[PDB]
Amino acid sequence: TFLLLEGNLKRIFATPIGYTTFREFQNVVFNCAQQELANFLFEMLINGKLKQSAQSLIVQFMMPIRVAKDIHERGEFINFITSDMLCVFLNRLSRVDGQEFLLMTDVQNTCHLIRHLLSRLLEAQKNPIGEKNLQEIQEDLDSLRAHFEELT
Amino acid sequence: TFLLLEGNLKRIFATPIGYTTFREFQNVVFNCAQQELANFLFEMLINGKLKQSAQSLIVQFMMPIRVAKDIHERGEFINFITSDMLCVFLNRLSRVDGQEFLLMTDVQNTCHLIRHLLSRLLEAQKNPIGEKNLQEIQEDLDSLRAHFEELT
Amino acid sequence: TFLLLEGNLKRIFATPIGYTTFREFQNVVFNCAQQELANFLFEMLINGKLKQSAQSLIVQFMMPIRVAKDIHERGEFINFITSDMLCVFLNRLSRVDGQEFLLMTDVQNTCHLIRHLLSRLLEAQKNPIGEKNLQEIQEDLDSLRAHFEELT
Amino acid sequence: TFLLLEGNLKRIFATPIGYTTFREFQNVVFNCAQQELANFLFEMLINGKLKQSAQSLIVQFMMPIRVAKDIHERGEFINFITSDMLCVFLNRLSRVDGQEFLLMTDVQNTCHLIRHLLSRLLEAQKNPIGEKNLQEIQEDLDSLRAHFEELT
Amino acid sequence: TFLLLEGNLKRIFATPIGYTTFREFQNVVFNCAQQELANFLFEMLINGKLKQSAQSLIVQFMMPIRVAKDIHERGEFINFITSDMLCVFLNRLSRVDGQEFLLMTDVQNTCHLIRHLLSRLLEAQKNPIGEKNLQEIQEDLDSLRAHFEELT
Amino acid sequence: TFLLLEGNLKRIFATPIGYTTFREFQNVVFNCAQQELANFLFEMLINGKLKQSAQSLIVQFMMPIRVAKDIHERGEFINFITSDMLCVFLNRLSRVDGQEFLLMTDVQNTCHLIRHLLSRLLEAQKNPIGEKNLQEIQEDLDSLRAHFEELT
């Protein structure tokens, strides 16, 4: 039974993780199961929480399974950005789901982008959640104020 | 000859404009040509500058031809952004070439994005071109400073 | 003013319609405006509802504007499907937003696909809206029952 | 020689598996080869069939190699579908090649999709292969008939 | 009836042409129809062959309909290539369906690409059709021989 | 500290390698660092050059890290091509970055493609670098001349 889970996991993780991959993983566990075994196995493979073979399954697959779960939840969120100056800037956006987008900006575009993003933070102030969220990062804003004026 | 140019243009603009489309347009003009006619026709169809049939060619195709040329030059530049607040924000980026990318951000991500973009403007100050570019938009920065502190 | 709207519309519709295109259209109208003019112009260009020049704007752009609005609302909905039998079937799915996906199925896959889709209709019966929705198409289901048994 | 095969395999499997990957794998084996060795090595790495090092090559690469071969043969076939009810349904299609497509359907669309898929099974009845194929799954159809009428 | 065909065509051509678009066009004609009218209308709109309104339908839609049909038949065929020298070359491939691909090559890659393509022409010589095909373009090959040796 | 690097690397390599991945890897090393440790760790993980744990990090990640670096440098370069004869040819292009493109060609297209690629080699002769590059592969060209005439 342990071997079959490994083979099925090797198969599903052989291709790029996507938005169906976490549910597809759940289907493999359910196929192998017995509700009591599934819950044991979810704990084992997602959390590494409880034979030698089990340690092997955690090492190969816990991180890929957790990323599948992350993608299910927030795959479309920004994950990383790089920039190269050439005057224009070559920006690369990468999402939690691994997809990337190339975007060129000149100095005027970048400033306009900043203003757009600020307008959204200003709109957050009107919503009860957002205002508290901004206060949660009050120091990061304050850093911005120093940092931006220093540019000026 | 005028009719053939129209048919060839209808064909090439029947599919999405891409990065080969402007050169493909040039090939249609060269195929129809005689260097003296090509230059006349480039002026006619790109600039609308110099029978009834010619006006028809300008109306249908000048804008699609100019967009093809724009894309050739700067298709990968940012062109537009939209945002929807849900606390997270659903952002959509659109480039000059018409391609779009969906990107989710929460309030912390947005602030971090702002800081990254500012760092690039700060790096521009070190390059001789960028510093003058920033001075060219000195008011847009100054607006930012007001606008950001008002948030704080 | 009428000419500028046309040029701006020719530009934005020169590239593929996407999820930002309807808001980008709104921005063109607002840029041209005066709240009273915008509302007049939205009525004119979306609904064709109220000089010669205005008729021209409706003819070229009302349908592309309405599709942009449709995509904004339901671009990801199924719009069309084709199938070619080769035993396997070459299926092509097209969405409201114009994007397509190729999917191969054999006879067993197709039956399994049907069962999956039925399970969802069965789940709809548990939700108050879905049960009434199914009753709204009670004849289409009844047709299915005849149609499927006739196959058997 | 064993080490070189591993390095070359690590390289080719470092990027997403695609439709060229299986032939690219064959090229690595041929590059390392001697027809007699290639056939031994194909048996070893695809089937795990026949030193310690060989077991290592099977464990890391047999499944990725078999998936590459599967994709070569049927990468465009449906592999998985998920659905989320919101009344509309958020469906995700995943193919053997790992590519996915998002498709929204309401209750009417889903029924129409079912009818389309049934029409294809009905067309299969006209082709000599398809009729026997449907008879091969005669129970799955019969299950459908119960299952659909129970909905009604 | 003529107006409805125009509206339906404006809608379907509002989004990028794809592989379902030609069949989707056929569905619009069939929806409007009467077998005798459909055949008249196919002749009218695909071939421009047989009131004022009909001429309008040919002008707006014949070329987009013919491209849809071309794509149905050979959308994946190469349509155009551009190259920019930078020593490396920036190549852009465009297909009949309008999709493009960027591919970088250095001088060695380009020669290797040529050899690969020649091997395929050499394989064509073994197939009865291909040998005659090569003879059909015997002059284009002969031009190559001059042209390549002149490089050497 | 060694364990954290492994976990962070498992995470970033869980998704497809892209153009941001190498810089994202650098960020993980810098986050873990101390300039002296980073340089040690870059040598360790990119070059395998200098406890048991370190060998484990090289085995799992050196190749994926080197591919990320390759992609950063030349991800858009051609990496592989396959062809299937059907008279038309089904070609598949694969880049260093793993992305692929399907392109159909008939016998005439293939010859035209060859001519285009030769024109670029002929243009290279005008540039000081390219002429020497062609001389570097003088034998590969000479092979072409034999090989092409033999076809004729």
mmCIF file of C-alpha atoms in Angstrom, chain D residues 5 8-9 12-13 16-32 38 42 45-46 64-76, chain E residues 116 120 123, chain F residues 79-86 88-94 100-104:
data_model
loop_
_atom_site.group_PDB
_atom_site.id
_atom_site.type_symbol
_atom_site.label_atom_id
_atom_site.label_comp_id
_atom_site.label_asym_id
_atom_site.label_seq_id
_atom_site.Cartn_x
_atom_site.Cartn_y
_atom_site.Cartn_z
ATOM 1 C CA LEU D 5 22.986 9.179 -18.054
ATOM 2 C CA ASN D 8 21.583 14.137 -18.711
ATOM 3 C CA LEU D 9 18.317 12.891 -17.269
ATOM 4 C CA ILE D 12 16.028 17.129 -19.291
ATOM 5 C CA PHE D 13 13.629 16.551 -16.425
ATOM 6 C CA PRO D 16 8.374 20.712 -17.681
ATOM 7 C CA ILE D 17 7.773 17.481 -19.542
ATOM 8 C CA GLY D 18 6.493 18.160 -23.045
ATOM 9 C CA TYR D 19 5.835 16.440 -26.355
ATOM 10 C CA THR D 20 9.524 16.381 -27.337
ATOM 11 C CA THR D 21 10.727 15.025 -24.017
ATOM 12 C CA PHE D 22 10.376 11.318 -24.752
ATOM 13 C CA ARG D 23 12.313 11.575 -28.008
ATOM 14 C CA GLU D 24 14.848 13.770 -26.225
ATOM 15 C CA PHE D 25 15.256 10.972 -23.661
ATOM 16 C CA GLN D 26 15.802 8.469 -26.485
ATOM 17 C CA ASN D 27 18.530 10.742 -27.857
ATOM 18 C CA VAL D 28 20.335 10.687 -24.501
ATOM 19 C CA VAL D 29 20.310 6.876 -24.501
ATOM 20 C CA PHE D 30 21.501 6.709 -28.108
ATOM 21 C CA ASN D 31 24.211 9.282 -27.382
ATOM 22 C CA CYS D 32 25.451 7.121 -24.502
ATOM 23 C CA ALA D 38 20.444 0.899 -25.809
ATOM 24 C CA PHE D 42 15.500 1.098 -22.497
ATOM 25 C CA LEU D 45 14.821 2.742 -17.441
ATOM 26 C CA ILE D 46 11.299 2.354 -18.885
ATOM 27 C CA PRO D 64 9.144 10.672 -15.353
ATOM 28 C CA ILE D 65 10.220 8.697 -18.447
ATOM 29 C CA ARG D 66 6.931 6.771 -18.563
ATOM 30 C CA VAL D 67 4.970 10.022 -18.257
ATOM 31 C CA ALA D 68 7.007 11.475 -21.103
ATOM 32 C CA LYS D 69 6.073 8.405 -23.140
ATOM 33 C CA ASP D 70 2.418 8.687 -22.121
ATOM 34 C CA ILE D 71 2.367 12.324 -23.203
ATOM 35 C CA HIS D 72 3.951 11.410 -26.545
ATOM 36 C CA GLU D 73 1.078 8.972 -27.050
ATOM 37 C CA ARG D 74 -1.918 10.701 -25.419
ATOM 38 C CA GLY D 75 -0.831 13.961 -23.796
ATOM 39 C CA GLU D 76 -3.951 15.734 -25.048
ATOM 40 C CA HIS E 116 17.652 18.861 -39.661
ATOM 41 C CA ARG E 120 13.430 15.693 -43.673
ATOM 42 C CA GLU E 123 13.273 11.350 -46.062
ATOM 43 C CA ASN F 79 17.239 23.432 -27.494
ATOM 44 C CA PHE F 80 15.665 20.613 -29.534
ATOM 45 C CA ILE F 81 13.524 19.883 -32.557
ATOM 46 C CA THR F 82 11.560 16.778 -33.561
ATOM 47 C CA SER F 83 9.794 16.064 -36.842
ATOM 48 C CA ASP F 84 7.149 13.577 -37.971
ATOM 49 C CA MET F 85 6.371 13.005 -41.655
ATOM 50 C CA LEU F 86 2.717 12.451 -42.570
ATOM 51 C CA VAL F 88 3.593 17.395 -44.577
ATOM 52 C CA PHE F 89 5.887 17.363 -41.540
ATOM 53 C CA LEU F 90 4.858 17.825 -37.885
ATOM 54 C CA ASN F 91 7.712 19.767 -36.253
ATOM 55 C CA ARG F 92 8.065 20.461 -32.511
ATOM 56 C CA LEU F 93 10.467 23.133 -31.282
ATOM 57 C CA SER F 94 11.665 23.102 -27.686
ATOM 58 C CA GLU F 100 7.527 24.188 -27.011
ATOM 59 C CA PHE F 101 5.839 25.203 -30.262
ATOM 60 C CA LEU F 102 4.120 23.041 -32.895
ATOM 61 C CA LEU F 103 4.722 24.004 -36.500
ATOM 62 C CA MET F 104 3.485 22.275 -39.667
#
